[PDB]
Write a protein that binds this ligand. Structure first.
Ligand code: NI
Ligand code: NI
Lengths: 110, 110
């Protein structure tokens, strides 16, 4: 069941390059994902054609770039990238975590 | 601009009864909100007719009840309540935080 996500009962998916992920839970219209970064790990710049995204900085800190605007964000901050906005991130410290949320769900994560 | 949410630049909205909130950022189809609870503060059981909700436990811990199922959740865990599922929460420690995400946005938070 995806009603309750228990972090310590869910393994990491290794993405390579210092990044790993867990798909947490979802409905058709809403999905949450945990992304863990080592220090200096780079989330490559990309965009989503049909998904809006809001990322919460749960731990550590990042330099985030969205449509050419760079900002340093720390735990408790967040950012939005709507459909077709280019966004990327660089982790500034070990054990930095983004909680990514999407509308609709990411079919490619299932 | 709602592209970047900076926690230390955004004041709390006091809800009473040991709970306070910040609307973080949103698009039409996606919204993120920070909810801070004192120890023992109760998020009353309720449901949303048209919103799906996923809550991340950012800090502290909660006893969460969804459609009669009670679970203790701690920082890093999460839960889902889809449209018309009854959900509530009780904070088990000071400075416990939920990051609530919704589809679509909550018009009533603006
Ligand atoms: Ni993205
Ligand atoms: Ni709710």
């Amino acid at each position: 069941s995806k009603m309750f996500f228990i972090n310590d009962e869910t393994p990491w998916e290794e993405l390579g390059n210092g990044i790993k992920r867990k798909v947490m839970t979802w409905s058709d219209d809403l999905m949450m994902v945990c992304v863990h970064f080592d220090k200096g790990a780079i989330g490559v710049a990309h965009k989503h054609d049909i998904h809006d995204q809001i990322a919460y900085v749960a731990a550590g800190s990042f330099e985030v770039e969205i449509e050419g605007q760079k900002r340093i964000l720390k735990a408790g901050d967040a950012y939005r990238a709507v459909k077709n906005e280019m966004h990327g991130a660089v982790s500034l410290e070990d054990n930095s975590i983004l909680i990514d949320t999407f509308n609709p769900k990411r079919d490619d994560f299932l």
